[PDB]
Enzyme design. Sequence first.
Site, PDB file in Angstrom:
ATOM      1  N   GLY A  14       5.276   0.486   8.432  1.00  0.00           N
ATOM      2  CA  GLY A  14       3.861  -0.518   9.035  1.00  0.00           C
ATOM      3  C   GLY A  14       3.801  -1.899   8.562  1.00  0.00           C
ATOM      4  O   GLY A  14       4.110  -2.531   8.082  1.00  0.00           O
ATOM      5  N   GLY A  16      -0.052  -4.599   8.235  1.00  0.00           N
ATOM      6  CA  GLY A  16      -0.289  -5.539   7.114  1.00  0.00           C
ATOM      7  C   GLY A  16      -1.186  -6.755   7.479  1.00  0.00           C
ATOM      8  O   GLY A  16      -0.849  -7.426   7.955  1.00  0.00           O
ATOM      9  N   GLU A  18       3.306  -5.978   5.747  1.00  0.00           N
ATOM     10  CA  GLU A  18       4.331  -5.770   6.161  1.00  0.00           C
ATOM     11  C   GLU A  18       4.605  -4.697   4.841  1.00  0.00           C
ATOM     12  O   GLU A  18       4.900  -4.642   3.534  1.00  0.00           O
ATOM     13  CB  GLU A  18       5.875  -6.214   5.829  1.00  0.00           C
ATOM     14  CG  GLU A  18       6.961  -5.771   7.080  1.00  0.00           C
ATOM     15  CD  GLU A  18       8.234  -6.388   6.300  1.00  0.00           C
ATOM     16  OE1 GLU A  18       8.475  -7.294   5.267  1.00  0.00           O
ATOM     17  OE2 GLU A  18       9.410  -5.773   7.657  1.00  0.00           O
ATOM     18  N   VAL A  19       4.969  -3.260   5.460  1.00  0.00           N
ATOM     19  CA  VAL A  19       5.190  -2.369   4.408  1.00  0.00           C
ATOM     20  C   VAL A  19       6.855  -1.865   4.813  1.00  0.00           C
ATOM     21  O   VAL A  19       7.044  -1.176   5.782  1.00  0.00           O
ATOM     22  CB  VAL A  19       4.648  -0.916   4.844  1.00  0.00           C
ATOM     23  CG1 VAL A  19       4.908   0.204   4.064  1.00  0.00           C
ATOM     24  CG2 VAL A  19       3.271  -1.709   5.142  1.00  0.00           C
ATOM     25  N   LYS A  34       4.945  -2.867  -0.479  1.00  0.00           N
ATOM     26  CA  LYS A  34       3.556  -3.186   0.555  1.00  0.00           C
ATOM     27  C   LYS A  34       3.847  -5.132  -0.136  1.00  0.00           C
ATOM     28  O   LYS A  34       3.893  -5.867  -0.921  1.00  0.00           O
ATOM     29  CB  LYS A  34       1.584  -3.207  -0.025  1.00  0.00           C
ATOM     30  CG  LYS A  34       1.558  -3.665   0.579  1.00  0.00           C
ATOM     31  CD  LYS A  34      -0.269  -2.564   1.011  1.00  0.00           C
ATOM     32  CE  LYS A  34      -0.703  -4.195   0.882  1.00  0.00           C
ATOM     33  NZ  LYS A  34      -2.350  -2.915   1.772  1.00  0.00           N
ATOM     34  N   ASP A 114     -13.022   1.334   4.382  1.00  0.00           N
ATOM     35  CA  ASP A 114     -12.721   1.130   6.145  1.00  0.00           C
ATOM     36  C   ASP A 114     -11.547   2.089   6.417  1.00  0.00           C
ATOM     37  O   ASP A 114     -10.975   2.097   6.089  1.00  0.00           O
ATOM     38  CB  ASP A 114     -11.534  -0.179   5.812  1.00  0.00           C
ATOM     39  CG  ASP A 114     -11.080  -0.269   6.568  1.00  0.00           C
ATOM     40  OD1 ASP A 114     -11.327  -0.344   8.183  1.00  0.00           O
ATOM     41  OD2 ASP A 114      -9.913  -1.823   7.132  1.00  0.00           O
TER      42      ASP A 114
HETATM   43  N1  C73 Z   1       2.030   3.878   0.860  1.00  0.00           N
HETATM   44  C1  C73 Z   1       2.220   4.720   2.653  1.00  0.00           C
HETATM   45  O1  C73 Z   1       3.641   5.421   1.941  1.00  0.00           O
HETATM   46  N2  C73 Z   1       2.263   3.537   3.178  1.00  0.00           N
HETATM   47  C2  C73 Z   1       2.683   4.077   4.260  1.00  0.00           C
HETATM   48  S1  C73 Z   1       3.904   5.112   4.982  1.00  0.00           S
HETATM   49  C3  C73 Z   1       4.289   4.478   6.927  1.00  0.00           C
HETATM   50  C4  C73 Z   1       5.110   5.373   7.544  1.00  0.00           C
HETATM   51  C5  C73 Z   1       5.470   5.101   8.572  1.00  0.00           C
HETATM   52  C6  C73 Z   1       5.913   5.531   9.824  1.00  0.00           C
HETATM   53  C7  C73 Z   1       6.408   6.692   9.323  1.00  0.00           C
HETATM   54 CL1  C73 Z   1       8.055   7.527  10.412  1.00  0.00          CL
HETATM   55  C8  C73 Z   1       6.386   7.152   8.207  1.00  0.00           C
HETATM   56  C9  C73 Z   1       5.774   6.478   6.780  1.00  0.00           C
HETATM   57  C10 C73 Z   1       3.054   3.885   7.004  1.00  0.00           C
HETATM   58  C11 C73 Z   1       2.436   3.161   5.825  1.00  0.00           C
HETATM   59  C12 C73 Z   1       1.176   2.208   5.376  1.00  0.00           C
HETATM   60  O2  C73 Z   1       0.919   2.128   3.847  1.00  0.00           O
HETATM   61  N3  C73 Z   1       1.311   1.939   6.773  1.00  0.00           N
HETATM   62  C13 C73 Z   1      -0.180   0.616   6.928  1.00  0.00           C
HETATM   63  C14 C73 Z   1      -0.183  -0.239   7.984  1.00  0.00           C
HETATM   64  C15 C73 Z   1      -1.487  -0.667   7.923  1.00  0.00           C
HETATM   65  C16 C73 Z   1      -2.487  -0.126   8.317  1.00  0.00           C
HETATM   66  N4  C73 Z   1      -2.423   1.220   7.348  1.00  0.00           N
HETATM   67  C17 C73 Z   1      -1.121   1.404   6.641  1.00  0.00           C
END
Ligand code: C73
Length: 255
Positions: A14, A16, A18-19, A34, A114
């Site tokens: 996702g 940020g 980048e995740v 992260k 938030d």
């Molecule tokens: N810790 C963890 O597993 N985080 C995940 S998993 C995921 C994820 C995304 C798609 C799929 Cl299909 C599965 C998991 C997205 C995010 C995440 O942190 N996204 C951040 C972006 C900015 C806003 N806050 C959320």
Amino acid sequence: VPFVEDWDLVQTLGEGGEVQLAVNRVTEEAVAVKIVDMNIKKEICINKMLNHENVVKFYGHRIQYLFLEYCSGGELFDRIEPDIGMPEPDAQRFFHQLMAGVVYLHGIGITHRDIKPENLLLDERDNLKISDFGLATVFRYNNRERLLNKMCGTLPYVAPELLKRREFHAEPVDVWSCGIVLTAMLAGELPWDQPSDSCQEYSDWKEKKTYLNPWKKIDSAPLALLHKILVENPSARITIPDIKKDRWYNKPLKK
Ligand SMILES: NC(=O)Nc1sc(-c2ccc(Cl)cc2)cc1C(=O)N[C@H]1CCCNC1
């Protein structure tokens, strides 16, 4: 054990900045990474204090790298159907879990600041986990409360006092954002751009015009809870202990 410390970055997750998903080469265990080029120091310090089933677990940090509990279900935001929301029983379960996580944070003197569906993730069993502590801060230390003064958060989710007052209590602000999250889950629409006296949608709510959307889409029971959460005066706003006594909060629901 050899190679046990080797992780493969297999996919981008996702925003940020980048995740990414990391998988252990030996164990196949997964973790979210992260990545921030590039504030972060504080996010790390606060993360180190967290240990609750409804809060994204922090494993460590190795630019800067944040290693977090992987939530395969993604964002709660993506479970909300525009203009529809989601089934009431699902919304209730998520709300119960959100409250449990918020009670935990408040109990340790931390305010998230938030809360919104983009920052609430779901694990493989659809358990809700509060995520993204980049704006979090301590509001209670050594049993003494500190008033907040910094303006932060996300407009449609912020409480009115943040916009109007020089200082304000942390807890009611988080309670308010949870109410906006509940509204989104039950209506698939946010009620206003911001809770300002210049916002017609907010004036309409204060005038109790519940025959209008999004309120009209919400059942009387959860609506009665929203009437107690989305109260302009933070000192009159319902507290979490009282939310736990609410009729809808305690209503048995099944799809
Ligand atoms: N810790 C963890 O597993 N985080 C995940 S998993 C995921 C994820 C995304 C798609 C799929 Cl299909 C599965 C998991 C997205 C995010 C995440 O942190 N996204 C951040 C972006 C900015 C806003 N806050 C959320």
